[PDB]
């Protein structure tokens, strides 16, 4: 009926991929995975995975979504067997937006609080925060005793505003008792979901305009933070520990699960957002150049973000007493601790804080609307009734996201947020990208994919990209999944410990999306009325080429198809 | 499409409506309301409210669901402006379906525990019950004394078992800290919902056959319990106190408004279940005799169950050497705290303890199946897609009920259960039955409703039934609603007091169903196109009489319609 919708401008796609790719502000926590005796621990594995897995998977997803011109779930009409990975990545993006809207609400609350002339992080009083009053220690306001107290800095005005004034974490004991959702956080979440609905109910062109307006100057805040970090006298000590140039210090074997999760969140692999955005893209586009540009931009952004973060770390460690490693909270609120104290020192604390919070709101809204648009595109291409009624389905999705995010905005919502993020994100995106690589490279065929690319644009992927798609990336993803299943530590906060049932709940939430692949395989095997050979043929052959099943001509059965690279 | 299913035999429909009318509310509440409200003089208004206010509301649904063989919601095709109240009686049936099955779990977990020779409520200790350090005392063997009534004494083995060993309320403080759902009760709830799905997944065919067992065993259980209690020492005093005629009670407070609410919540007229059950019956079936027999069976069953209840209460009063007013209780305190404690002191306690709880299970199974089939039929006749997919829609409904009943089976779910029951049931179903009576007796017309009955069975209801449908029933429902609004008390438990925000959320849940009538009126007024008199005439006239609207012939705009009885 209605033709396939497309972008209004080609530059809109290159801006939207970055607006969804700008998550290195908050999700890039270097001191969390900081080194112990290795030096480079979150930059060597990050770059390695971006080189060997990031760019190949980005190019593969872009070309697949551009050629098939379908959603994440209906891209697997080229191999109906591995079609459960579409629902898997849809649930992945849904669970991710669930806690991403919480970060957006936190940023909105900080933006609303920063309007005051006196910032809430400039004194140790009752300035919109909730100090316990046991340790009202002004970092530079008054002289205090040099007591480390485990070198922990959680009584600073920034932390007292974050974990007590914004989150109200003191009222909740833990995951077992989360309390009631906060009213101000509820209003913030309602405003966020209303903005998302008003941005997404129109179409992809409105989302393109929104990512154009919001992502206009995200780099400027990072640039001014970096230029203020290194120019100030006492902030070089921490950044010196950051760029620890040790090529013979080794604490890991370049193996990290959090690095893979970070590259997948940055690029978008395992969420269906790349395929969904490539579906609306034009037929003739250089996905290779776009992938290289996106990877380079993400690498530079990660580098400058780590620079600024460790510069603020060293500034805190010099202007204050306790050491660098325990000065800030390593978790989902690292930037909320770092950036307010840094902006308090800089001139014009109110204006720059407002600008930084507007940037955070912009990037968060962009990423969340990208994920929600990917989910909507997938479930609309899957069910044409949902594609016809786009507004009702969008309203339903936004309302479900708002309802299922109340457990993350409550008194102890940060614990559920971290649990969901870690378990769901890591395990689900790992299994999803592994299954997608196995299906595209082996079952569908690297030769057929390369031929489709050559028919799409003149240039053909060389030996490097094909060998990465076929051998390097699937083996890497399988090894990461194995090291994640084996080397699994119990989920915990900086100080709070989770009961054993929280780990089981997280594993069950991950498995809910994981088992979506074998369930659909069994569904396809049982639905087809035929012999075992005919079932296996209908399983691993495209829908358009199903007639060849009747002609007894299947390429996957022969070993020449598998051996071909 | 294909014609809907029908009852193979009218005995199935009769037993189904009997099992729906006869539930746990006729065992724990009716005898206590009889005793407290003057003894025997409570039968004078009750039967009165049975005849003038309860019986005409039971003949109104069996004749509206048989002439218009539709669901609870879709039956409002004679007056679309009230179809919203057809949705409320569905949503209410969901709000009642969450906690009610929990009670069905309470009778299941007590059944398995009664499969041992030593019942868990016969002695003090850790016999499947969580005991206090030094608080509990033994019922028999102590002649020290007592200064408090045994109805609220929570230091007995049975009460402590019911609270801590079953509900686990000792490790909870209120709705703010409910805790995690009990797995030993989650398994019982799973078994209950599985039985419900297996009964209702293939239509009325399997439900009618399950009712043949689940609606005939409770009568045998009551018969054997009465024939055993009539020989128990001390039952004569209980029978005399239950049948004591005290005509001194002439006050409206608790004597004239308690029999009305008891009749209303015992007969079940206006819940939407009767419209669904009467939609699978033949067009020539007599609804008059069916309604009369159902009301008489309900009232006689309540009256004869009061005999066994008070025989057990008199036996316990003689054993405890206390008066009957001290061992007089209602609700779960009777069937779970008072009756098992009395069975403990009987001979062959295993048989009686198994048969009492299997009667309690059979009483709840019929009511839950009816309340769920009401929603099923109301949503299937409205949405034609759900008619073909019944085995999936019933499964979805059961799974949603199970997931939304996890807040009542937890360590502190009794408070949420009481909140839901009281607010939702009372307020929403009262407003719903009031709107239904107003729509059927005034807007549609009692003369047309009598002509429909005359076309169905051949005879037309006399002037008494029309007078009790047009004037008596609406005024009675309005009086009950006004009393419920005025005599509304703040939510409270035995000792715990609900927070101020509990009353507001309870009222919100109650209004969620009640606002569906004005919202649907506005929706119907805005959807229809034309002038005000052309949009109003399309919501008060039947869909088969809309052509008369084009001919400027509307009967609801004349004085003869409103002044005809
Ligand atoms: C026992 N007769 C009187 C009806 C009792 C049963 C229910 C019930 C039970 C289980 C599931 C749904 C429902 C919906 C109908 C309703 C409405 C108000 C109060 C109670 C009830
Ligand atoms: Cl009754
Ligand atoms: Na029953």
PDB file of N, CA, C and O in Angstrom, chain B residues 291-344:
ATOM      1  N   UNK B 291     -34.197 -17.816  37.484  1.00  0.00           N
ATOM      2  CA  UNK B 291     -33.784 -16.800  38.446  1.00  0.00           C
ATOM      3  C   UNK B 291     -34.365 -17.076  39.826  1.00  0.00           C
ATOM      4  O   UNK B 291     -33.666 -16.941  40.841  1.00  0.00           O
ATOM      5  N   UNK B 292     -35.645 -17.462  39.889  1.00  0.00           N
ATOM      6  CA  UNK B 292     -36.250 -17.766  41.183  1.00  0.00           C
ATOM      7  C   UNK B 292     -35.534 -18.922  41.868  1.00  0.00           C
ATOM      8  O   UNK B 292     -35.221 -18.845  43.063  1.00  0.00           O
ATOM      9  N   UNK B 293     -35.266 -19.999  41.126  1.00  0.00           N
ATOM     10  CA  UNK B 293     -34.603 -21.161  41.705  1.00  0.00           C
ATOM     11  C   UNK B 293     -33.185 -20.821  42.143  1.00  0.00           C
ATOM     12  O   UNK B 293     -32.729 -21.276  43.195  1.00  0.00           O
ATOM     13  N   UNK B 294     -32.475 -20.011  41.354  1.00  0.00           N
ATOM     14  CA  UNK B 294     -31.116 -19.633  41.730  1.00  0.00           C
ATOM     15  C   UNK B 294     -31.108 -18.806  43.009  1.00  0.00           C
ATOM     16  O   UNK B 294     -30.306 -19.062  43.916  1.00  0.00           O
ATOM     17  N   UNK B 295     -32.001 -17.815  43.107  1.00  0.00           N
ATOM     18  CA  UNK B 295     -32.054 -16.990  44.310  1.00  0.00           C
ATOM     19  C   UNK B 295     -32.448 -17.815  45.531  1.00  0.00           C
ATOM     20  O   UNK B 295     -31.848 -17.672  46.606  1.00  0.00           O
ATOM     21  N   UNK B 296     -33.448 -18.689  45.384  1.00  0.00           N
ATOM     22  CA  UNK B 296     -33.863 -19.545  46.486  1.00  0.00           C
ATOM     23  C   UNK B 296     -32.773 -20.519  46.911  1.00  0.00           C
ATOM     24  O   UNK B 296     -32.579 -20.720  48.114  1.00  0.00           O
ATOM     25  N   UNK B 297     -32.050 -21.112  45.961  1.00  0.00           N
ATOM     26  CA  UNK B 297     -30.958 -22.013  46.304  1.00  0.00           C
ATOM     27  C   UNK B 297     -29.846 -21.259  47.019  1.00  0.00           C
ATOM     28  O   UNK B 297     -29.297 -21.746  48.010  1.00  0.00           O
ATOM     29  N   UNK B 298     -29.514 -20.052  46.550  1.00  0.00           N
ATOM     30  CA  UNK B 298     -28.487 -19.254  47.215  1.00  0.00           C
ATOM     31  C   UNK B 298     -28.876 -18.947  48.657  1.00  0.00           C
ATOM     32  O   UNK B 298     -28.090 -19.170  49.588  1.00  0.00           O
ATOM     33  N   UNK B 299     -30.092 -18.435  48.863  1.00  0.00           N
ATOM     34  CA  UNK B 299     -30.527 -18.086  50.211  1.00  0.00           C
ATOM     35  C   UNK B 299     -30.645 -19.298  51.128  1.00  0.00           C
ATOM     36  O   UNK B 299     -30.206 -19.224  52.281  1.00  0.00           O
ATOM     37  N   UNK B 300     -31.200 -20.410  50.648  1.00  0.00           N
ATOM     38  CA  UNK B 300     -31.291 -21.610  51.469  1.00  0.00           C
ATOM     39  C   UNK B 300     -29.913 -22.191  51.780  1.00  0.00           C
ATOM     40  O   UNK B 300     -29.685 -22.667  52.895  1.00  0.00           O
ATOM     41  N   UNK B 301     -28.976 -22.142  50.828  1.00  0.00           N
ATOM     42  CA  UNK B 301     -27.626 -22.623  51.090  1.00  0.00           C
ATOM     43  C   UNK B 301     -26.940 -21.773  52.149  1.00  0.00           C
ATOM     44  O   UNK B 301     -26.282 -22.305  53.051  1.00  0.00           O
ATOM     45  N   UNK B 302     -27.083 -20.448  52.059  1.00  0.00           N
ATOM     46  CA  UNK B 302     -26.537 -19.577  53.095  1.00  0.00           C
ATOM     47  C   UNK B 302     -27.152 -19.894  54.456  1.00  0.00           C
ATOM     48  O   UNK B 302     -26.447 -19.994  55.469  1.00  0.00           O
ATOM     49  N   UNK B 303     -28.476 -20.072  54.486  1.00  0.00           N
ATOM     50  CA  UNK B 303     -29.170 -20.318  55.747  1.00  0.00           C
ATOM     51  C   UNK B 303     -28.733 -21.639  56.375  1.00  0.00           C
ATOM     52  O   UNK B 303     -28.544 -21.725  57.593  1.00  0.00           O
ATOM     53  N   UNK B 304     -28.563 -22.683  55.555  1.00  0.00           N
ATOM     54  CA  UNK B 304     -28.176 -23.993  56.083  1.00  0.00           C
ATOM     55  C   UNK B 304     -26.689 -24.098  56.370  1.00  0.00           C
ATOM     56  O   UNK B 304     -26.285 -24.958  57.164  1.00  0.00           O
ATOM     57  N   UNK B 305     -25.857 -23.259  55.751  1.00  0.00           N
ATOM     58  CA  UNK B 305     -24.452 -23.184  56.123  1.00  0.00           C
ATOM     59  C   UNK B 305     -24.236 -22.410  57.413  1.00  0.00           C
ATOM     60  O   UNK B 305     -23.295 -22.721  58.158  1.00  0.00           O
ATOM     61  N   UNK B 306     -25.081 -21.411  57.684  1.00  0.00           N
ATOM     62  CA  UNK B 306     -25.049 -20.760  58.982  1.00  0.00           C
ATOM     63  C   UNK B 306     -25.245 -21.726  60.133  1.00  0.00           C
ATOM     64  O   UNK B 306     -24.639 -21.560  61.197  1.00  0.00           O
ATOM     65  N   UNK B 307     -26.080 -22.753  59.937  1.00  0.00           N
ATOM     66  CA  UNK B 307     -26.282 -23.771  60.962  1.00  0.00           C
ATOM     67  C   UNK B 307     -24.990 -24.487  61.328  1.00  0.00           C
ATOM     68  O   UNK B 307     -24.663 -24.593  62.515  1.00  0.00           O
ATOM     69  N   UNK B 308     -24.249 -24.986  60.337  1.00  0.00           N
ATOM     70  CA  UNK B 308     -22.993 -25.672  60.618  1.00  0.00           C
ATOM     71  C   UNK B 308     -21.945 -24.714  61.170  1.00  0.00           C
ATOM     72  O   UNK B 308     -21.184 -25.078  62.079  1.00  0.00           O
ATOM     73  N   UNK B 309     -21.891 -23.489  60.637  1.00  0.00           N
ATOM     74  CA  UNK B 309     -20.949 -22.497  61.150  1.00  0.00           C
ATOM     75  C   UNK B 309     -21.181 -22.259  62.637  1.00  0.00           C
ATOM     76  O   UNK B 309     -20.241 -22.301  63.441  1.00  0.00           O
ATOM     77  N   UNK B 310     -22.434 -22.034  63.033  1.00  0.00           N
ATOM     78  CA  UNK B 310     -22.721 -21.772  64.436  1.00  0.00           C
ATOM     79  C   UNK B 310     -22.661 -23.022  65.304  1.00  0.00           C
ATOM     80  O   UNK B 310     -22.361 -22.902  66.493  1.00  0.00           O
ATOM     81  N   UNK B 311     -22.899 -24.211  64.749  1.00  0.00           N
ATOM     82  CA  UNK B 311     -22.640 -25.427  65.511  1.00  0.00           C
ATOM     83  C   UNK B 311     -21.162 -25.568  65.848  1.00  0.00           C
ATOM     84  O   UNK B 311     -20.816 -25.895  66.990  1.00  0.00           O
ATOM     85  N   UNK B 312     -20.283 -25.300  64.880  1.00  0.00           N
ATOM     86  CA  UNK B 312     -18.848 -25.331  65.155  1.00  0.00           C
ATOM     87  C   UNK B 312     -18.454 -24.231  66.141  1.00  0.00           C
ATOM     88  O   UNK B 312     -17.658 -24.470  67.057  1.00  0.00           O
ATOM     89  N   UNK B 313     -19.010 -23.025  65.990  1.00  0.00           N
ATOM     90  CA  UNK B 313     -18.711 -21.931  66.907  1.00  0.00           C
ATOM     91  C   UNK B 313     -19.220 -22.180  68.322  1.00  0.00           C
ATOM     92  O   UNK B 313     -18.607 -21.691  69.278  1.00  0.00           O
ATOM     93  N   UNK B 314     -20.315 -22.920  68.480  1.00  0.00           N
ATOM     94  CA  UNK B 314     -20.820 -23.266  69.791  1.00  0.00           C
ATOM     95  C   UNK B 314     -20.022 -24.387  70.416  1.00  0.00           C
ATOM     96  O   UNK B 314     -19.780 -24.385  71.625  1.00  0.00           O
ATOM     97  N   UNK B 315     -19.598 -25.354  69.597  1.00  0.00           N
ATOM     98  CA  UNK B 315     -18.689 -26.381  70.093  1.00  0.00           C
ATOM     99  C   UNK B 315     -17.388 -25.766  70.593  1.00  0.00           C
ATOM    100  O   UNK B 315     -16.896 -26.127  71.669  1.00  0.00           O
ATOM    101  N   UNK B 316     -16.825 -24.823  69.834  1.00  0.00           N
ATOM    102  CA  UNK B 316     -15.587 -24.177  70.260  1.00  0.00           C
ATOM    103  C   UNK B 316     -15.808 -23.322  71.501  1.00  0.00           C
ATOM    104  O   UNK B 316     -14.935 -23.244  72.374  1.00  0.00           O
ATOM    105  N   UNK B 317     -16.971 -22.672  71.599  1.00  0.00           N
ATOM    106  CA  UNK B 317     -17.271 -21.876  72.785  1.00  0.00           C
ATOM    107  C   UNK B 317     -17.434 -22.752  74.021  1.00  0.00           C
ATOM    108  O   UNK B 317     -17.049 -22.348  75.123  1.00  0.00           O
ATOM    109  N   UNK B 318     -18.003 -23.947  73.857  1.00  0.00           N
ATOM    110  CA  UNK B 318     -18.131 -24.869  74.981  1.00  0.00           C
ATOM    111  C   UNK B 318     -16.773 -25.439  75.376  1.00  0.00           C
ATOM    112  O   UNK B 318     -16.488 -25.624  76.565  1.00  0.00           O
ATOM    113  N   UNK B 319     -15.922 -25.727  74.387  1.00  0.00           N
ATOM    114  CA  UNK B 319     -14.592 -26.247  74.690  1.00  0.00           C
ATOM    115  C   UNK B 319     -13.730 -25.195  75.377  1.00  0.00           C
ATOM    116  O   UNK B 319     -13.015 -25.500  76.339  1.00  0.00           O
ATOM    117  N   UNK B 320     -13.784 -23.954  74.901  1.00  0.00           N
ATOM    118  CA  UNK B 320     -13.015 -22.861  75.480  1.00  0.00           C
ATOM    119  C   UNK B 320     -13.679 -22.250  76.708  1.00  0.00           C
ATOM    120  O   UNK B 320     -13.096 -21.349  77.320  1.00  0.00           O
ATOM    121  N   UNK B 321     -14.875 -22.717  77.074  1.00  0.00           N
ATOM    122  CA  UNK B 321     -15.596 -22.226  78.250  1.00  0.00           C
ATOM    123  C   UNK B 321     -15.828 -20.719  78.175  1.00  0.00           C
ATOM    124  O   UNK B 321     -15.688 -19.998  79.166  1.00  0.00           O
ATOM    125  N   UNK B 322     -16.184 -20.234  76.985  1.00  0.00           N
ATOM    126  CA  UNK B 322     -16.445 -18.820  76.758  1.00  0.00           C
ATOM    127  C   UNK B 322     -17.787 -18.673  76.055  1.00  0.00           C
ATOM    128  O   UNK B 322     -18.386 -19.645  75.592  1.00  0.00           O
ATOM    129  N   UNK B 323     -18.255 -17.430  75.982  1.00  0.00           N
ATOM    130  CA  UNK B 323     -19.528 -17.148  75.335  1.00  0.00           C
ATOM    131  C   UNK B 323     -19.379 -17.172  73.817  1.00  0.00           C
ATOM    132  O   UNK B 323     -18.273 -17.104  73.275  1.00  0.00           O
ATOM    133  N   UNK B 324     -20.519 -17.272  73.129  1.00  0.00           N
ATOM    134  CA  UNK B 324     -20.515 -17.331  71.673  1.00  0.00           C
ATOM    135  C   UNK B 324     -20.102 -16.000  71.058  1.00  0.00           C
ATOM    136  O   UNK B 324     -19.490 -15.978  69.984  1.00  0.00           O
ATOM    137  N   UNK B 325     -20.408 -14.881  71.722  1.00  0.00           N
ATOM    138  CA  UNK B 325     -20.043 -13.576  71.182  1.00  0.00           C
ATOM    139  C   UNK B 325     -18.532 -13.382  71.140  1.00  0.00           C
ATOM    140  O   UNK B 325     -18.032 -12.574  70.347  1.00  0.00           O
ATOM    141  N   UNK B 326     -17.789 -14.108  71.979  1.00  0.00           N
ATOM    142  CA  UNK B 326     -16.335 -13.997  71.970  1.00  0.00           C
ATOM    143  C   UNK B 326     -15.707 -14.771  70.817  1.00  0.00           C
ATOM    144  O   UNK B 326     -14.649 -14.377  70.316  1.00  0.00           O
ATOM    145  N   UNK B 327     -16.339 -15.863  70.386  1.00  0.00           N
ATOM    146  CA  UNK B 327     -15.812 -16.690  69.305  1.00  0.00           C
ATOM    147  C   UNK B 327     -16.547 -16.371  68.010  1.00  0.00           C
ATOM    148  O   UNK B 327     -16.512 -17.154  67.054  1.00  0.00           O
ATOM    149  N   UNK B 328     -17.217 -15.223  67.971  1.00  0.00           N
ATOM    150  CA  UNK B 328     -17.957 -14.786  66.795  1.00  0.00           C
ATOM    151  C   UNK B 328     -17.055 -13.931  65.916  1.00  0.00           C
ATOM    152  O   UNK B 328     -16.615 -12.854  66.331  1.00  0.00           O
ATOM    153  N   UNK B 329     -16.783 -14.414  64.706  1.00  0.00           N
ATOM    154  CA  UNK B 329     -15.910 -13.728  63.767  1.00  0.00           C
ATOM    155  C   UNK B 329     -16.471 -13.906  62.361  1.00  0.00           C
ATOM    156  O   UNK B 329     -17.460 -14.616  62.149  1.00  0.00           O
ATOM    157  N   UNK B 330     -15.831 -13.257  61.390  1.00  0.00           N
ATOM    158  CA  UNK B 330     -16.230 -13.354  59.995  1.00  0.00           C
ATOM    159  C   UNK B 330     -14.989 -13.310  59.116  1.00  0.00           C
ATOM    160  O   UNK B 330     -13.880 -13.030  59.578  1.00  0.00           O
ATOM    161  N   UNK B 331     -15.191 -13.584  57.830  1.00  0.00           N
ATOM    162  CA  UNK B 331     -14.104 -13.543  56.874  1.00  0.00           C
ATOM    163  C   UNK B 331     -13.129 -14.695  57.046  1.00  0.00           C
ATOM    164  O   UNK B 331     -13.468 -15.785  57.521  1.00  0.00           O
ATOM    165  N   UNK B 332     -11.882 -14.431  56.648  1.00  0.00           N
ATOM    166  CA  UNK B 332     -10.836 -15.444  56.728  1.00  0.00           C
ATOM    167  C   UNK B 332     -10.575 -15.901  58.158  1.00  0.00           C
ATOM    168  O   UNK B 332     -10.020 -16.986  58.356  1.00  0.00           O
ATOM    169  N   UNK B 333     -10.961 -15.103  59.155  1.00  0.00           N
ATOM    170  CA  UNK B 333     -10.802 -15.537  60.533  1.00  0.00           C
ATOM    171  C   UNK B 333     -11.705 -16.703  60.888  1.00  0.00           C
ATOM    172  O   UNK B 333     -11.444 -17.434  61.846  1.00  0.00           O
ATOM    173  N   UNK B 334     -12.781 -16.893  60.123  1.00  0.00           N
ATOM    174  CA  UNK B 334     -13.709 -17.981  60.415  1.00  0.00           C
ATOM    175  C   UNK B 334     -13.272 -19.275  59.738  1.00  0.00           C
ATOM    176  O   UNK B 334     -13.126 -20.312  60.393  1.00  0.00           O
ATOM    177  N   UNK B 335     -13.051 -19.230  58.422  1.00  0.00           N
ATOM    178  CA  UNK B 335     -12.799 -20.457  57.673  1.00  0.00           C
ATOM    179  C   UNK B 335     -11.353 -20.915  57.824  1.00  0.00           C
ATOM    180  O   UNK B 335     -11.041 -22.087  57.577  1.00  0.00           O
ATOM    181  N   UNK B 336     -10.448 -20.019  58.223  1.00  0.00           N
ATOM    182  CA  UNK B 336      -9.030 -20.346  58.293  1.00  0.00           C
ATOM    183  C   UNK B 336      -8.440 -20.275  59.693  1.00  0.00           C
ATOM    184  O   UNK B 336      -7.390 -20.880  59.929  1.00  0.00           O
ATOM    185  N   UNK B 337      -9.076 -19.561  60.621  1.00  0.00           N
ATOM    186  CA  UNK B 337      -8.524 -19.390  61.960  1.00  0.00           C
ATOM    187  C   UNK B 337      -9.431 -20.058  62.986  1.00  0.00           C
ATOM    188  O   UNK B 337      -8.960 -20.590  63.998  1.00  0.00           O
ATOM    189  N   UNK B 338     -10.736 -20.062  62.720  1.00  0.00           N
ATOM    190  CA  UNK B 338     -11.713 -20.621  63.645  1.00  0.00           C
ATOM    191  C   UNK B 338     -12.131 -22.041  63.292  1.00  0.00           C
ATOM    192  O   UNK B 338     -12.210 -22.895  64.180  1.00  0.00           O
ATOM    193  N   UNK B 339     -12.404 -22.316  62.017  1.00  0.00           N
ATOM    194  CA  UNK B 339     -12.870 -23.648  61.638  1.00  0.00           C
ATOM    195  C   UNK B 339     -11.779 -24.709  61.730  1.00  0.00           C
ATOM    196  O   UNK B 339     -12.048 -25.785  62.292  1.00  0.00           O
ATOM    197  N   UNK B 340     -10.558 -24.505  61.209  1.00  0.00           N
ATOM    198  CA  UNK B 340      -9.519 -25.534  61.399  1.00  0.00           C
ATOM    199  C   UNK B 340      -9.162 -25.760  62.858  1.00  0.00           C
ATOM    200  O   UNK B 340      -8.883 -26.898  63.257  1.00  0.00           O
ATOM    201  N   UNK B 341      -9.170 -24.698  63.668  1.00  0.00           N
ATOM    202  CA  UNK B 341      -8.897 -24.851  65.093  1.00  0.00           C
ATOM    203  C   UNK B 341      -9.952 -25.723  65.763  1.00  0.00           C
ATOM    204  O   UNK B 341      -9.645 -26.482  66.691  1.00  0.00           O
ATOM    205  N   UNK B 342     -11.201 -25.634  65.303  1.00  0.00           N
ATOM    206  CA  UNK B 342     -12.253 -26.484  65.851  1.00  0.00           C
ATOM    207  C   UNK B 342     -12.131 -27.912  65.339  1.00  0.00           C
ATOM    208  O   UNK B 342     -12.358 -28.868  66.090  1.00  0.00           O
ATOM    209  N   UNK B 343     -11.779 -28.077  64.062  1.00  0.00           N
ATOM    210  CA  UNK B 343     -11.603 -29.415  63.498  1.00  0.00           C
ATOM    211  C   UNK B 343     -10.459 -30.138  64.199  1.00  0.00           C
ATOM    212  O   UNK B 343     -10.472 -31.368  64.342  1.00  0.00           O
ATOM    213  N   UNK B 344      -9.459 -29.381  64.660  1.00  0.00           N
ATOM    214  CA  UNK B 344      -8.327 -29.982  65.363  1.00  0.00           C
ATOM    215  C   UNK B 344      -8.781 -30.790  66.574  1.00  0.00           C
ATOM    216  O   UNK B 344      -8.232 -31.861  66.856  1.00  0.00           O
TER     217      UNK B 344
END
